[PDB]
Structure formats: structure tokens, C-alpha cells
UniProtKB/Swiss-Prot annotation:
Subunit annotation: Homotetramer. Heterotetramer with RYR2. Interacts with CALM. Interacts with FKBP1A. Interacts with SELENON.
This protein's name: Ryanodine receptor 3
Ranges: Sequence repeats: 1-106, 107-206
Record remark: domains: The calcium release channel activity resides in the C-terminal region while the remaining part of the protein resides in the cytoplasm.
Function as written in the Swiss-Prot or TrEMBL entry: Cytosolic calcium-activated calcium channel that mediates the release of Ca(2+) from the sarcoplasmic reticulum into the cytoplasm in muscle and thereby plays a role in triggering muscle contraction. May regulate Ca(2+) release by other calcium channels. Calcium channel that mediates Ca(2+)-induced Ca(2+) release from the endoplasmic reticulum in non-muscle cells. Contributes to cellular calcium ion homeostasis. Plays a role in cellular calcium signaling.
Residues of the full protein shown: 848 to 1053 of 4870
Compartments, record wording: Sarcoplasmic reticulum membrane
Tissue: Brain, skeletal muscle, placenta and possibly liver and kidney. In brain, highest levels are found in the cerebellum, hippocampus, caudate nucleus and amygdala, with lower levels in the corpus callosum, substantia nigra and thalamus.
Related illness: Congenital myopathy 20: An autosomal recessive neuromuscular disorder characterized by variable manifestations. Some patients have congenital limb or distal contractures manifesting soon after birth, while others develop muscle weakness with difficulty running and climbing stairs in early childhood. Additional features may include facial dysmorphism, and delayed development with intellectual disability. Skeletal muscle biopsy may show variation in fiber size with type 1 fiber predominance and atrophy, hypertrophic type 2 fibers, and abundant nemaline bodies.
Family under the similarity heading: Belongs to the ryanodine receptor (TC 1.A.3.1) family. RYR3 subfamily.
Organism of this sequence: Homo sapiens (Human)
Amino acid sequence: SFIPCPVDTSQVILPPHLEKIRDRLAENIHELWGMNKIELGWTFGKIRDDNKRQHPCLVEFSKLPETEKNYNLQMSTETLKTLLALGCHIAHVNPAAEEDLKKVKLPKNYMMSNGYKPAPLDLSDVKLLPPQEILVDKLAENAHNVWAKDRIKQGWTYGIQQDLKNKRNPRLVPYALLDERTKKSNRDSLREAVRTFVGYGYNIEP
Ligand SMILES: Nc1ncnc2c1ncn2[C@@H]1O[C@H](COP(=O)(O)OP(=O)(O)CP(=O)(O)O)[C@@H](O)[C@H]1O
Ligand SMILES: O=C(C[C@H](NCCCO)C(=O)O)Nc1ccc2ccccc2c1
């Protein structure tokens, strides 16, 4: 009895100039995913093995399989279209920002056997304004409805234990019922996404 209804973006055109930031956002978001998984004990693997914690997507964003790469780009585009659908304006302010933009140097033990070492953008200094933090909460919750909707449209349903064969997932629940740990992790991701706009010189203002 779950009806995820994301913010309607069906009438939003993504201006051609925002396609770079769109690409930037997806890449940096992916790096965070890899760092988080490595920190959860995951390591590279040609094929996914939960018992061993091998993941084929622990590579650079480019080397990602097309099905997995395109998903990250579509979600990235929907994030920007969701901002636009919410009345926000996205315009480039500080062009030199991308110049003094440095990645995070993670310990050497973070490099996988596959040679991939995650290097997300160090955006710690980017302090978000109280209004921007509200936007993050919206994007976070709405990100969950977007994921859920797609998963439901592809034959997925709730289950107590995730089952790749049965297309069942315990997180297919309304945002309110979701575990706070996951909800917080998602907000953190969206928070970095909003920071990626600042760190790249763009201004996010309604
Ligand atoms: N919560 C998330 N936030 C951002 N990107 C994510 C994400 N979960 C997955 N991705 C992107 O999807 C790609 C592959 O998705 P995948 O389904 O393998 O994630 P996953 O293995 O963590 C599912 P699970 O959370 O059930 O373990 C990842 O490399 C990353 O680019
Ligand atoms: O589906 C994705 C991949 C996508 N990565 C590209 C970055 C674009 O900015 C994105 O996070 O937007 N993440 C995602 C989002 C919400 C979720 C809610 C519940 C369970 C899993 C979830 C997974």
C-alpha cells in the first residue's frame, strides 16, 4: 500500500548549459557511494557477491556499466529538474570556484585491487544556509520517492530481506516508515549534492 509520488518534473526542460554540472554532480555522488561502501567493508569484484562483499561498480564513473551509468545520469538530471520544478534558480556565480576545487585524499588502504580509489570533492568548508538545508530535506525525501517509483515500476516489492531474484527490498516503504539511519545517510548525500553546486560556483536560490 505504498504510493510514491515524486515532485512532477514532466514539464521541466534542463537548460543545455547545466549539463556539465549535471555530469559533475553524478560523478561526485558516485565517489561518495564508493567511499561509503569501502567503509562498510566492500571491495571490488567482477561479479556481485554479498557473502564476500565484492561489487562490480567500485570503479571510476566512466568504467561503470551502461545500465548503471545511465541510472546515475538520469537520477542526476531528475535532481536538477526537481530543483527547477521547485522554483529554484540555478545560475553560475563564481567561475573561479572550480579552480580552487580540491578532492579528498583518502588513506592508501582505500584503493581497491581494481586500482580505483574514491576521491570525492572536499566540500567540508561549504556551509549551507538554513534555507538551503530545508531544500536538502525536500530533495532527500523526494529522492526516495523517485527511487521507489522506479523500483515499483520494475516489479519490485517490499520484503523483510532483500532478494535480487524475487525483486523484493525492505526499504520500499514510505519515507516516514524508513529507518532513520538510512534517511540520515540519504540526507547527507543530497547535502553533498547541494554543496557540489556551491563548490562549482553555482548559486541555488528560489
Ligand atoms: N544510495 C545511493 N546514492 C547514490 N548513488 C547510489 C546509491 N545507491 C547506488 N548508487 C549508484 O548506483 C550504482 C550501483 O547501484 P547498486 O544497486 O549496486 O547500489 P547498491 O549495491 O548499494 C544497492 P544496496 O543498497 O541494496 O546494497 C552505484 O555505483 C552508485 O553509482
Ligand atoms: O538511486 C540512486 C542512484 C543515484 N545516483 C546518481 C546521483 C544523482 O545525483 C541517486 O542517488 O540519485 N540513489 C538512491 C536514492 C534514494 C534511495 C532511497 C532508498 C533506497 C535507495 C536509494 C538510492
